[PDB]
Design a protein around this ligand. Structure first.
Ligand SMILES: COC1CN(S(=O)(=O)N2CCCC2)C1
Ligand SMILES: [Cl-]
Ligand SMILES: [Cl-]
Ligand SMILES: [Zn+2]
Ligand SMILES: [Zn+2]
Length: 572
């Protein structure tokens, strides 16, 4: 314990030896308190001016205004639960590894990611780009590395905010050991028949409909109450078994990240009373946001196969597994494991399962005892499943089946339109020029034109924003692919995404205009949040050229395209 965290603790203690106070009124009983020291949501105006009807919708406007979960302790699974998890985890890493080779990620790869600007949740150097251009930083990584090979840690400390930051150096060493999981698509659907990494919103609906085609019971989509807080040291040990597939240096580096920064953690949390509190603990999810996605997917795949085993009566008791029950669990995994993975869509802590039958609904002993407690339902109340794949929630969406005038079938993502409009009206951080604010609006507009084209208000607002922002200005700012981030014409990108590259579309005839591209039903559009039929919305649509001109006047004398005549009503 303190042998693995002390140096990190000893080091911090000194840089702040002037104020090292062992507060006796610290609010902790689940963390291990160590000491304390002295320390010290903006609206996008381009989108808001082009969405005026929503200025009076509280679900939109309230989105732009303005832990007791982390300080909890998950129990220890029982012998039979621990055996089920170890056997399943061993088999799952083997399956994921059959067509993939673990490998170390490179300084070169990491530098390019930073040059391309990506969320690396990092903290001598201003930005992350400058540090990647300083050899001293790399000498620091080297000292830290050999330390990890020396089987010890000095500088890999978390900062809670609850999303924990590490400094760029410790992010590098995490990426070097484990980035292959994401960089080489270990959770692609093709490689892990449950995963959806890299799939994209335009694919998720087709995937759920493919699961719906399997013979079986209802579709179950139980959310876990605070997934990251329910990750057990036993979960962290089964995730570590990926190092068993590694060799040489890599295996040792990966082992150190798991041992020193996962199965042991040191965190700095700011407390108002404002001090810095240096706390530690073993279990719970604390990793980069990308590694956390992959390991969440893995452990979720594991938990859901075990829940399926319980429904199928592969085992009777989580208390203890018989010897013949071990061979049966193994027989089941080898005989039907891949078939049972294909009955799932799993995105980190989010899942949809189509089990063999509805015994799964009341198979709760392993799921509860693994600590993966379901959200807003009583611990022993059977799960309520969905009968129709078009009503299943997944990755904050539902999916509609939409028939084009030519008979071809689109499966399209959807959510409450208030949520879509409210999110596009928010920027993150400040220092934003009018130009950079306009390019973010453009990025939302292009997303709506490709993914939400079927919502009458969003196709009209997207056309209006793309009309209001200079034509050649470039849009700016893990299951997803951002095809809207481009200056290419949006009808050409629509054709590539929905027709050309769409494996569920046999007829490859390109669409010639936006009017070939259908909408949801008028009533189905209202149900999912549309303002069609309101007076405010009618005035907005009728007078849209006046709103477009207001924003053009603010941005100034630039080159604009009118995209509004791409809609039937706006044709002279
Ligand atoms: C469900 O009710 C719908 C409200 N209308 S509409 O005709 O005003 N409308 C539909 C296209 C945009 C204007 C019927
Ligand atoms: Cl249903
Ligand atoms: Cl975006
Ligand atoms: Zn370290
Ligand atoms: Zn909908």
């Amino acid at each position: 314990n303190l042998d693995i965290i002390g140096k990190r603790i000893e080091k911090i203690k000194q840089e702040h030896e002037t104020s090292w106070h062992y507060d006796q009124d610290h609010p902790y009983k689940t963390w291990a308190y160590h000491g304390s020291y002295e320390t010290k949501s903006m609206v996008n105006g381009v989108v808001r001016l082009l969405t005026k009807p929503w200025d009076i919708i509280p679900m939109v406007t309230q989105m732009a205004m303005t832990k007791e979960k982390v300080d909890t302790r998950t129990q220890e699974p029982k012998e039979g639960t621990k055996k089920l998890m170890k056997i399943t985890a061993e088999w799952l890493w083997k399956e994921l590894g059959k067509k993939k080779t673990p490998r170390m990620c490179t300084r070169e790869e990491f530098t390019r990611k930073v040059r391309s600007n990506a969320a690396l949740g990092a903290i001598k150097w201003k930005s992350a780009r400058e540090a990647v251009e300083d050899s001293g930083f790399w000498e620091l990584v080297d000292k830290e590395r050999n330390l990890h090979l020396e089987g010890k840690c000095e500088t890999c400390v978390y900062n809670m905010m609850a999303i924990w930051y590490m400094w760029l150096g410790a992010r590098f060493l995490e990426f070097e050991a484990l980035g292959f999981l994401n960089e080489d698509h270990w959770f692609s659907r093709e490689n892990s028949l449950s995963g959806v990494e890299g799939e994209g919103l335009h694919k998720l609906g087709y995937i759920l409909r493919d699961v719906s085609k399997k013979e079986g019971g209802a579709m179950y989509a139980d959310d876990t109450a605070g997934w990251d807080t329910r990750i057990t040291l036993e979960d962290l040990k089964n995730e570590e078994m990926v190092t068993n597939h590694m060799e040489g240096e890599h295996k040792k580096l990966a082992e150190a990240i798991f041992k020193l920064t996962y199965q042991n953690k040191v965190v700095r949390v700011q407390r108002p009373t404002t001090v810095m509190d240096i706390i530690s603990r073993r279990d719970q999810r604390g990793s980069g946001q990308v590694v956390t996605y992959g390991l969440n997917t893995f452990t979720n795949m594991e938990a859901q196969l075990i829940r399926q085993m319980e429904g199928e009566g592969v085992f009777k008791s989580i208390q203890h597994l018989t010897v013949t029950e071990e061979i049966a669990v193994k027989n089941w995994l080898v005989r039907v494991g891949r078939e049972r993975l294909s009955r799932m869509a799993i995105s980190g802590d989010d899942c949809v399962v189509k089990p063999l039958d509805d015994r799964f609904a009341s198979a709760l002993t392993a799921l509860n005892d693994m600590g993966k407690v379901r959200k807003d339902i009583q611990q022993w109340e059977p799960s309520r499943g969905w009968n129709d794949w078009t009503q299943v929630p997944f990755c904050s969406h539902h999916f509609h089946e939409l028939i084009m005038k030519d008979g071809r079938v689109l499966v399209v993502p959807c959510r409450n339109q208030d949520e879509l409009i409210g999110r596009a009206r928010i920027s993150q951080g400040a220092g934003w020029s009018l130009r950079e604010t306009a390019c973010l609006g453009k990025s939302y507009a292009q997303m709506w034109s490709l993914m939400y084209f079927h919502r009458r208000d969003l196709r009209l607002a997207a056309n209006a924003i793309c009309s209001a922002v200079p034509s050649h200005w470039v849009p700016t700012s893990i299951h997803a692919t951002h095809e809207w981030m481009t200056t290419e014409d949006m009808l050409t990108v629509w054709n590539r995404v929905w027709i050309q590259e769409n494996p569920w579309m046999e007829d490859k005839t390109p669409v010639e205009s936006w009017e070939e591209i259908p909408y949801l039903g008028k009533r189905e559009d209202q149900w999912c949040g549309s303002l069609i039929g309101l007076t405010s919305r009618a005035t907005w649509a009728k007078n849209i050229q006046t709103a477009i001109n207001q924003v053009r006047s603010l941005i100034g004398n630039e080159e604009y395209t009118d995209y509004m005549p791409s809609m039937k009503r706006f044709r002279r």
